[model samples]
Target: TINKSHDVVIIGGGPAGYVAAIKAAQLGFNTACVEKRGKLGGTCLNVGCIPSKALLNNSHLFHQMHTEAQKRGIDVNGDIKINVANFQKAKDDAVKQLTGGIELLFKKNKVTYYKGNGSFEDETKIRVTPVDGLEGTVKEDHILDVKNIIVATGSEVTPFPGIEIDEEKIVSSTGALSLKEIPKRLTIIGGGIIGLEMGSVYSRLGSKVTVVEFQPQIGASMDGEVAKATQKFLKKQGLDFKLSTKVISAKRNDDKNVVEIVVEDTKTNKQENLEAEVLLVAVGRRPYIAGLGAEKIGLEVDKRGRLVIDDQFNSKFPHIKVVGDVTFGPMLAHKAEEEGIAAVEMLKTGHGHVNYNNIPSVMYSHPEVAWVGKTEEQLKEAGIDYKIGKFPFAANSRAKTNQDTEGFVKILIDSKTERILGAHIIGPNAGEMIAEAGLALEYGASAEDVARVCHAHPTLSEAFKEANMAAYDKAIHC
Candidate 1:
């Protein structure tokens, strides 16, 4: 058992918690991290981001092997098929290796990891309850008297009101990750990023995929025009969409495999039913503070059930700080990591800060979508004057040469000063191309700055650079 009090105790082992633990130890503080999963990495690495990406990669490959290979005149045997077990193995192996690396890093950095439910016994004392059947540092229960505490409990998926996720017929994003068999038809409840991503996987693997969104458009968080473009592309890939729809209920069938999703058009009041062997409820996620004892400790949370922290990441108690999904901010892993680092520096030096303005978000669907800074719709709503410049992948020589042109690059700028406001991309490696735009936004660089920078010829990034040219004045290539 860990007998002595810790200099800092970080609760949760997600991106924020682990990073905070490592940084605290690096700053010469005796640090410890508490995780309930009996592993180092949290949802992002274990069941959420990493595993989903692996599945997406393999699923894309499977699609190409069946559809794209024949066009290249490569005569292949017709026996190529996706073995569910093998596909799951690849995803599981990727998760295992990465999580194990985190454990090694924890050891190297001298950060003690406690596997249990870490909750507050009082204000400054955190007690760790050992998880069942797992070997832990604490045989019974132990309290950690810490000079400071960081809460990073991350988030969990929000469920529909009447639908129960049996992880079989009805599932959450977690259940969508490890389906042993491919369903004949799949109906996704929400057309957000998670729903589209998971839907794309099953659609590529021959499932008749249908998406139902309560909003008028898919990817509600995305900019309007860009989201519309994505909707068009997804439809071409055989994803059926029912926008302006709300799911009323999920009813079971005698087949034990088929489930009915009864939905109504929100505006028209017209109702329709969709059938699916597996139904994914990918509505969204909210802060998960299941057992942190925030109420007992008198920590304040907002109306959305997120921890309310001051400017310096301090809670009601000065010594206790909060970060990641549990706190107030965008619920992205990279964002959480930055908050973790910034929080640590606040404890060490006197200052550290994160620019919420420059944060980027990416989606891993085919012809991936990525964006940063303010979206055009957001600008319009805020009454900010902006100019837009766009260049489609169809115009990019590299995209034409590679036969993968599917989307475009869009740049938004201040109409007067030409300052880069945002960059939205939906095409091959759009996720990678967005980094240049993010860096540009970080320094308040203008479209002229982006256009003036030398970009390699016959590369996808040139589309972005060209789009910047259009934003400033005109594009020579466009």
Candidate 2:
């Protein structure tokens, strides 16, 4: 039985909420984390990040064996096949281990774990209703007395207004993960990160993909120059795009499991109908503040339905804090993780800070794209004089040896001080190489600072160092 009162209570066991609870308990405060799913780790562990990566990795293995092995004189005569059932089990097992580990962590830390829907009864207490029939839930609706509450409900898939997601004919990210077989044609509504990532998975598995985005470019909020290159690479892999377009409506045929989508072209203002056996909508996500009883507790929510938190992440009530998707900021899992620990320090010991500028962004597609700090477009608009350094993977010896050369690295530096301002990468293992740039930006390293560092020969990271050299001076190889 959990104690009726606790020093701190976090409502929602997500990347943010659970981490905060652990930190609070580590700080010698009694902590309790409440989750509606009974299973912990929220969307990231259960459905979002972990499961998606499983499918992507499996699909890549299948694609590589069939397409790329011949170049290295690795010959295979077996027919390529994908056992969807077995692949799904791999994803399920991963989710199970992580979620179960959260329970053990709570036990080890002596933090109470409540399985139910948590809503505010008042400013000082949260009312927990039972989750379902068979479980270790509260006997009746009980109030959890606490000195402070941390809201980390996270975000949910933003559905199209009229286009309903039955998770069958029209699916969300959750449904897209568990498809029984690769559809002949997959139409995705939004050409954002989630959309492109999923599109690459299915496309690699021999499905024709069509992506429609409202903006002129894809990559969600990526820089313009890199977005064009990224889109070009995806196009070569059999992915189509309809930019500056909008989805007018979608009608699903239950009998055939086919969706008739109506879309309008932004330039021509013309309308047309498209068909897809499976439709995945990856428009974006919104902060999930629903069922938290925001109105009942007099919590202030913005017009966009985001919880209003101050500089210290405090709500209207000083004792109640908000973090992750429920509050302002990017919806990245790592971003939430940072705020989770920081929010704990602020509530207990009172000193914590996160550098929003240093947050890195990546698109985990083939020849992945990653970047940190300002974009060249933002700098030009601000009228700051910046220098650009670029090096293509074609010029890098390692990429040449592996035959995976496709994209380039572009770095931006301040013209006056030569300090690194931004770095964008699109090539093999770009996701891993961008970390060096992030560290450089954190230390306020100039272009020469990164260029002078000794890097291993014939490595993908050598391209990174060369790009920095090109920024301040000239690259030797290129």
Candidate 3:
């Protein structure tokens, strides 16, 4: 019902879109954000990162209490059990609170929030059409004329060619989040981060989880040696893996609550059948641009369906910019947030930049895996001579004291200059620990510089410092 002109209009209230809206307002511009979803925070907050983490943390706690409590001299009187409804509710409650908090932030920042599907009326005009059956949706179509526009449409999960996801026995990552009952056996296709993460959750929850990967190894795009270590650690936790395998088909049983899958070994050309109570398809994700009307404004979309943009985040017109998963770079929420801030700042000031190499990747399985900067494979391909330094959690005092030691910290440096090249960690607090590595990478710091910094005793981070010391000269007390 409201039609007006704005200083800036951002389509898609995702990590990128909402951040851009807030920044534009902070910069003294009249800004509005249009999102078709009933809630804010997009997939990362709702179905993807936050919800999955909740499940992961709770499931790990459940697993630890059952298996590890006795060795610490604690006696258990009864069997530990999971309340399925409450476990699912906890995740849902978190999502509800976080999404509503975003709405409150919009009000605080004075950014106009429009709940509707946004498409281009022209280059300067965006049309918002109400989405049916969604609460808080605009009652009627609204047109927003703007001085600038930003697109952050995000991405959707890529599905297998022949398999169907009924969200019951056969499911995607979204369906994997809220299962009503724990399946006796769970089979997963694709062993990327999402696949392994969900696998870890179910395995901890008493499901005999099996992961199938088409590639020779798991942890897609991870450093090869680190990937091997990740697989070894997860195997000890009781999750089964089938590498160099391809799934030919997956189908739900007609009368029973089971799924049957046929898989072929890529190297041996041998085929095998697998049956499970539930099946998860965790292949990957692709850019989402269904109703944005890029064609109406003659916006260029690349072969991968990414909206073509320049180094400054501009499309064909300087006033119209694109960022996040729908544009370029990694499909991560934090990555998207940085691009959002950078894009808006560029409009305010003359220059802005994002160091693409410094973006860290994390997989939140128990004994998490995290890394930043160039990997060994990349360095080798680029012909950059590098030296390796490693410190195991088994050798760290804090890890031994905690009695949860399993993995190690590995760092790479330029052999000649002793400059930090990359850092890879596969152990406790790896996800959080990578931030230090990211800061080091961004500053182009040397291993010697990081090693010289005073690190507290009996801390997991000391392993990081020790690893750096190993890179430069030799580690103490390791």
In the order shown, the candidates' Cα RMSDs to the true structure are 1.3, 1.5, 1.0
What is candidate 3's lDDT per residue for 1-478, written digit by digit as tens?
6688999999988899999999989999899999998888888998899999999999988988898888888777698999999999999999999999989989999999999899999989998999998788899999999999999989998989999998889999999999999999999999999999999999999999999999999999899899999999899898899999989998999787689899999999999999999999988999999988998889999999889999999999899999898988988889999999999999899577888988999999999999988889999999999999899999999998988888899999999998998999999899999999998988889999999999999799999999999998999977
Worst 10 residues of 3 by lDDT: 68-77
Model 3 clashes, total count: 0
- Computed on alpha carbons, the lDDT of every model, listed in order, comes to 0.90, 0.90, 0.92
Query: What TM-score would you give candidate 1 relative to the actual structure?
Result: 0.98
In candidate 2, which residue pairs clash? none
Candidate 2 lDDT trough over 10 residues, lowest sum: 133-142
- Candidate 1 has its poorest 10 consecutive residues by lDDT at 131-140
Per-candidate count of clashing residue pairs (backbone under 3 Å) = 0, 0, 0
Candidate 2, residue 11: Cα displacement in angstroms equals 0.8
Better of 1 and 3 by TM-score: 3
Q: How far is candidate 1 from the true structure (C-alpha RMSD, Å)?
A: 1.3
Write candidate 1's Cα lDDT for 255-308 as tens digits.
Answer: 666998899999989898788999999888999898888888788989998999
TM-score of every candidate relative to the true structure: 0.98, 0.97, 0.98
Considering every candidate listed, which one attains the maximal TM-score?
Answer: 3
Question: How many steric overlaps does candidate 1 have?
Answer: 0
Question: Candidate 2: lDDT of 160?
Answer: 85
Off by over 4 Å in 2: 1-3, 133-135
